[PDB]
Amino acid sequence: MQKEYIQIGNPNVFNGQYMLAVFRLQGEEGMTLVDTASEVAAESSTGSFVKIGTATAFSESLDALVYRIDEKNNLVWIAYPWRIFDRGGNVQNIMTFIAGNVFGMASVKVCKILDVYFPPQMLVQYDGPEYTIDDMRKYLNIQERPIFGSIIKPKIGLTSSEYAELCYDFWSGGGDFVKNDEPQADQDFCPYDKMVQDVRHAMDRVEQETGKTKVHSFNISSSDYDTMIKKADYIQSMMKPGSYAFLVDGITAGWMAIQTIRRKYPNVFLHFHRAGHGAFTRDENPIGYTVPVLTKFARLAGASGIHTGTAGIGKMAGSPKEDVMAARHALKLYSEGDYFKQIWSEIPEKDADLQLAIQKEAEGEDYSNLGYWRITKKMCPIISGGLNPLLIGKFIDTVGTQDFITTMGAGVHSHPMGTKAGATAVLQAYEAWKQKISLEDYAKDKEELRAAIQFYDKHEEPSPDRPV
Amino acid sequence: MQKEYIQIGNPNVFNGQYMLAVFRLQGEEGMTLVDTASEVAAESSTGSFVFSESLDALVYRIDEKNNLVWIAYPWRIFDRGGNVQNIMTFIAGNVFGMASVKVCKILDVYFPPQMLVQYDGPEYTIDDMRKYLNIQERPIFGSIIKPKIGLTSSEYAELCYDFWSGGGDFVKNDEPQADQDFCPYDKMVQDVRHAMDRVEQETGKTKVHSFNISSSDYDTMIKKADYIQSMMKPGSYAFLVDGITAGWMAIQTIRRKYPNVFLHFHRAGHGAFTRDENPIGYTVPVLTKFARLAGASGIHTGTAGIGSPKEDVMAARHALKLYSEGDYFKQIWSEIPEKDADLQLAIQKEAEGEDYSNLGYWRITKKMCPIISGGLNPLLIGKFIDTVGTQDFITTMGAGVHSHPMGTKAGATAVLQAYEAWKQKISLEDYAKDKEELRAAIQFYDKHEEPSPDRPV
Ligand SMILES: [Mg+2]
Ligand SMILES: [Mg+2]
Structure with a gap:
């Protein structure tokens, strides 16, 4: 000493x-x-x-x-x-x-x-994000609302065609986004080349039938860098620009894998799957670093999105504090941890344009007017856990933003009318929230949401969605 | 559920x-x-x-x-x-x-x-490094440089020179030593080579330097690796990768892209997974088994209590042996079916401390070695060898060589002399009657209160 x-x-x-x-x-x-x-x-x-x-x-x-x-x-x-x-x-x-x-x-x-x-x-010295939720909304041709996505169940074991067909069902019902499971890769029963090909074909069908674009987030985490790059290049050759994101297991594959994809594919949404973080971040572990710290470094490294929980919604008990802290560290020009205030900009704090942008952020306005070359761009939370149509409104009100991507499993696939209807029910619930109509009233006209009210109030889910 | x-x-x-x-x-x-x-x-x-x-x-x-x-x-x-x-x-x-x-x-x-069958395992081993160093049997004696960050490239290289000149075999970069402006990476590599050249010229002996190639991204790591390969003679360099923070993929990438280079798994950060105080994670023996599966040539351990030795000894066994025992599973590091008589004979020979030559190279997982971090010194190296039960390790001593009262060169000499005493079954005191570096060490390291003691990895 x-x-x-x-x-x-x-x-x-x-x-x-x-x-x-x-x-x-x-x-x-x-x-x-x-x-x-x-x-x-x-x-x-x-x-x-x-x-x-x-x-x-x-x-x-x-x-x-x-x-x-x-x-x-x-x-x-x-x-x-x-x-x-x-x-x-x-x-x-x-x-x-x-x-x-x-x-x-x-x-x-x-x-x-x-x-x-x-x-x-x-x-100044770090990349920050480059492709954001705003870019993904533009590709999806939507404004304001959250991006509603799904995990596929069972998460591992479906063939490439079975996996793609559930993607087709979810997107067909109006869902926007599907992610691979965090260790879904080149298993012989769902080989990577066919998985990408079958996803493309499924997406083509949805686009032809609905006129709407969709996004699939592919796990490119691999044995080594050459394999990951080969997967990324293959996907780029197989999928239209904007229609794919790159999922990297940031904790197990590593920080280097996050930065590599950020720099080699800057115009692709970089999906930081934080599986494994709990050993660093859990309250029960006296040695490590907390979820807000992880989130800050993920934004610095340039992830477009990183997972959080549901801010206590649906989850029995559960505090919203950590998830909301993480969401604000990810998204905002001005964010706060337990000990430090953070302005996500190289502009010195005293600058009048910066302070005005900070005040306008508090009023609900984006801060891109400062110049993307003078700020750290926004990263968004990806919401994992037990949301469903009955809870999406409460969640928006709790997290205090619409700038998130949901990745619902049971909350769409357990819908009694099926996955397509389940996705529709989430959109219908969002519309009810936006228009300030009760779920019950909005569902008088809409059988998908009406079925969701009856089902998700009471159902004991055999395999509930789990945290990320 | x-x-x-x-x-x-x-x-x-x-x-x-x-x-x-x-x-x-x-x-x-x-x-x-x-x-x-x-x-x-x-x-x-x-x-x-x-x-x-x-x-x-x-x-x-x-x-x-x-x-x-x-x-x-x-x-x-x-x-x-x-x-x-x-x-x-x-x-x-x-x-x-x-x-x-x-x-x-x-x-x-x-x-x-x-x-x-499906995984690489190691390719370049401590045995390969011994061959480059022109030595047999004994441990590879190495060093960290102190202060670990802050020296110029020439200052860093000169302490490498001193350690190697005293008989030391191996120096490692600090785990986060990289392209800092005050010790730029290219000059660091250049000056290490110049230092190594002087030692080769003056002693006739080869030496090894382990370079941290952990980087912002894959292209930068590969540029560094390729630069080192162009600047250092084959065998004289190892690649240090921060496996936990840079990631498992970085480990496997170097294993496969540079298979004939010692892959040094620096486990900085593992404690959040492995520490006993953390109820959530995975233990050091588990980390070590996966490091061997991924093909690391070496991974750090502690000093086996030289505290209980159990964990570090278990790690050394999982790293090096054909047959190793965890707390719950026995592990044969081979694709050969367990009933195979040759396999069982080899396991028996290994258990008897005897060499086995009845298997054949392509159906076994090659050995990975421990890299010993902590406060070893000439007074303790013999006790460590006895405790861990193998000489197949690399030491990375700091204070145990650099605080030697006669300097870093003498400190490296004292470690080798201590090893000679151990090998020859001569007491440290008897062997040091003739060996002033070891003599100084014996009278110093039992009482010195080190201002900056070596810390674990
Ligand atoms: Mg999953
Ligand atoms: Mg160090």
Whole structure:
């Protein structure tokens, strides 16, 4: 333990040269919080303090600094000179410093990153998203409303033709979007080449019959990069521009896979499937980093969408706080964590145009007028869990935005009239919400929604939708 | 929940078509273990249940008292192409995000022989690195550089020079050492080569440097790898990949694109999955088994308590051996059927500490070695060898060489001298009567309070 990593009250940490982080931290018995914090700061930056030498100018330092402590609540604030991070906008490298070996120190019994802050100067160095929910709405030729999507059930085991036919049914009923299961890939019983081909053919039929475009999100997570690229290129050759998204298992395949697809296919929606995140993010795990932190780094890395839950809706009990925090970190110009306020722009905070855009955001207006080259573009939540037509209105009112993509399973496929009618019932429920008509009244005219009222009030689902 | 996923006592799970797993599993308060097990089996396989075959994961044993659940995965459900990230997405994915499951820790996994056929395993091993170094039998003695981030390229390379000049074999980049402006990647590679050239010229010995190629994206990682290949002589470099943060795909990509380069799996970040304090995740032995399956040449462990040695010893066995034992499953690292007499003889020979030569290269999973992180030094290396029961490891010492009172070069010499004492069955004190580097070390490392001690990986 070297005391030089402890600089309580250091004014300079807010000067824009530092990424900030809050850790919940607790050392093993006999180690003080400040001693523990020094070791965490050291191992997440320069390792050892060196007074003479190193590459810094005489006036410069690369050490992380503990600048605030709350012993009562086992909290420490650490400032990272972001110059220490790899260039080229490398997000896996940041996570390797702050969320790497520190999680392996047996002397640190609690080590949870609760929040991080990116100064405007740092945001310049990272991609942020490029293709957004606004671009997907444009391809779908819809405005304002959420994008209503589906997972297929059973999630693994259908043949390519069976899988595509349920996509056809959902899209045919007015559904917008279908995702592969997060580990749906090149299983021999549903081979990847045929899966893509059969999805295209199913989508062609819906387009011919309804006149409407649709989107399918393909899992391209693979053994290796060459295979993932071969899948992405194959999909681009098999599907019309806009009609496909790329699903990457960001936690298991890796941060590098997210950034690779963001950069090689910038005009394709990049769907960050966060399967596996719970080991980092769950409340029960004292070592890791929280869902809001994950979401912030996913936006920095350039994901177009990342999953959340249903903000407590449908889920018995369940707090909305975390999902709404994540949705706002994903979507807004101004968002807040538990410890840091975040403006998602390289424009300095004092700028009059920026502050006006922040105020207009509070009034419900998009902030693209600032220039996409001066902001971090929006990433959207992808909603996993037990929504159904009876709950979509309450969910919109709870999350406070329509800028999300649902991925409903039971809430469409268990509809007693079938998946097509199930998708229709969700759209009808949305219309009732928009027009301020009760479900019951709106359904007097509409058998799909009427059937959904009778069914989803009472049905005990044998296999409920699960979290992502 | 669906009962179809509960098949307690099903004898077919042992027929070779299933990957087996043991979870420490507990539902949230108010959920029975059987219901929790059914939901976890479903969400890690077919999702929901709907002519002779089936892809559903099967819960085949439950220990209520100890909150243990045994699950069989038909490995046909996994992606083709030997995709390891896909396996982890099934068994270590959304199940960790199920608030209805308050404990969910994969404790062991079992790979049947015909499953192993589908995966690469390692290609370049510690034995290949020994051949490049022109050594036999002994461990490969390596170092981290300190301060780990902040030195110029020339300063970094000069400490490599000092360590290698003293007899050290191996240096690794820090796990997040990359293209920082103050130590740019291209100059780092150039200056490491210049340093290595001087050592070769002055000692006649070859040396190895492990370069972090973890990057923002695949093209950048490949550019770095190709640059290193153009700048360093074959064998003299290894590729360090931050497997947890860069991802499983990065590991497999380097394994396949550069098969004849040592693939150094730096496990920074694994603690969120593996730590005992975290009820949700998967353990170090499980991580190690999947690292070998994916084809890492080495992966980090600790010092086997040199704390209990059990975990690090188990990791070393899963990494290196033809036959290794987890807490719940015995593992033969071969596609050969278990009844095969040659296979059983080889396992017997290995258990007797004897070399076996009766198998043939293409039907076994090659060895991956531990990379030892923590506070070893000349006083402790013999005790570590004895404790881990193998010499097939790479050390990456920091303070245990760089804090040597005579300097880094002398520190590396002292480690080799300590190894010589161990090999020759001579006490450290007796061997050091003639060896001032070791003598200084023996009198220093038993009392020095290190200002910046080595930390785990
Ligand atoms: Mg899924
Ligand atoms: Mg390190």
